[PDB]
Design a protein around this ligand. Structure first.
Ligand SMILES: Nc1ncnc2c1ncn2[C@@H]1O[C@H](C[C@@H](N)CC[C@H](N)C(=O)O)[C@@H](O)[C@H]1O
Ligand SMILES: Nc1ncnc2c1ncn2[C@@H]1O[C@H](C[C@@H](N)CC[C@H](N)C(=O)O)[C@@H](O)[C@H]1O
Lengths: 241, 241
């Protein structure tokens, strides 16, 4: 059977190692290029990854993310789903939303989900408190498989109220229950779940607890070890249940 | 002093009657072209306005809304704000978001606000329950005036939890408190508030209760009369307070 694994590898190199039409569900949150959007100007609370400075020319960052999304479109099975978590950023005192580059991809946007994180450290009073991230639910372009009946009532809507995972030592993770919602509704046991920016391995832990197959890529061997330790101490608990 | 009024007039004709740089705050929700997006195919729960069928060729609808937004950019004062309420629609089983046309306007998007309506009559289980509308906060292009300190804690964030106004006889209105948040934070007493799709006059009632000047346009004399009756029975109550 397929060997589930977290591979230390560049995300595009990993995606290009997968055949067409081979992944049922992708759940992922890329680096957000906050430092790079600022042209390298430091800021308080700056996200610094183990082996990545998050400081790419913004136009090049957008082209890179488009290549990622286009590879995801290739590797998705017909009827599969890709959940891409991003957030509105700020550029020159104006909104800088992900939609400005997402719309050019081969993937077809099925629905935008709102992740309500409840609170944010950013209390700048020049705008409303920005505690929302977006989860773009894409499907392949050539309705997706979706079983909303599997969810509790409080996750059947387009706003998901999930607090950030403050106990996770990774600098910018998402909670396990977020990945669980995506996986449970769009896959069957044994189906392949992929996270090409696996980080602390949240998507893979969720897939494992739900008895789905899993594959993750990240460039940090420290984060791979973080996943392995987390998997070992996971009692296969599903946080939804 | 300026004569506050609800005028029965086409929205573009009304906007083009205003000089440049003359309006501090716009709050508006246009017809959403749900029937027109469907190419005129009827649907249950169809919105039918008094004098408007909501059935425009979708490309022409988008060009029209762009003309509206471009006129708003012209008539806004520097530092003013326009709050444009729209919603993701569905086309051919895929997402059809307003951003696909909003991005071409002369207005500069400052922030997207999420209006959480709590529930929706649309219980189609092929997607998550779509009870969110968006409020696009734009400013003029050549930070906007904004006093978040005037709001209660529960409206300082990017999600506003406001139930729909089910007692309003207009077929598709928004609640008074929505307009109050926008007006209170971006204007001073006496400043001009405009709604070019005034409907039941919600924006104008809110402006009047806050002692702002107001101007509204709509094509229905029935809705103008609806506003006049509503204003007369309004005890100048501010729902926020
Ligand atoms: N070229 C790249 N290929 C693969 N991973 C990368 C690359 N550049 C950055 N990363 C990783 O992208 C990840 C982004 C994280 N925010 C993801 C965290 C993850 N959602 C979690 O729950 O832990 C980081 O762990 C980076 O190490
Ligand atoms: N060309 C037009 N010019 C002005 N108003 C129009 C035009 N076409 C449609 N309308 C109006 O657009 C309005 C859209 C409404 N959904 C607005 C309701 C409003 N937000 C309220 O709270 O009552 C309707 O009242 C229509 O009569």
């Amino acid at each position: 059977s397929f060997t589930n694994k977290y591979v230390v590898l560049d995300s595009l190199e990993g995606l290009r190692s997968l055949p067409d039409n081979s992944v049922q569900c992708v759940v992922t949150s890329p680096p957000y290029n906050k430092l790079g959007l600022r042209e390298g100007r430091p800021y308080l609370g700056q996200i610094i990854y183990d082996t990545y400075d998050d400081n790419m020319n913004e136009d090049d960052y957008q082209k890179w993310q488009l290549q990622i999304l286009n590879e995801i479109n290739r590797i998705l099975k017909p009827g599969g789903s890709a959940f891409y978590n991003h957030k509105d950023r700020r550029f020159c005192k104006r909104d800088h939303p992900p939609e400005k580059f997402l719309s050019d991809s081969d993937l077809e946007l099925y629905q935008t989900i709102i992740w309500d994180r409840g609170s944010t450290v950013n209390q700048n009073a020049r705008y409303f408190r920005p505690y929302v991230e977006k989860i773009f639910w894409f499907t392949k372009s050539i309705t997706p498989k979706f079983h909303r009946d599997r969810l509790p009532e409080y996750f059947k809507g387009v706003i998901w109220r999930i607090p950030p995972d403050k106990r996770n030592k990774h600098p910018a993770p998402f909670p396990a229950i977020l990945a669980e919602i995506c996986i449970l509704t769009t896959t069957e046991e044994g189906d392949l779940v992929l996270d090409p920016f696996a980080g602390s391995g949240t998507t893979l832990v969720a897939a494992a607890s739900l008895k789905r197959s899993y594959l993750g890529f990240d460039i940090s061997s420290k984060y791979q070890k973080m996943f392995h330790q987390r998997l070992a101490t996971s009692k296969s608990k599903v946080h939804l249940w």
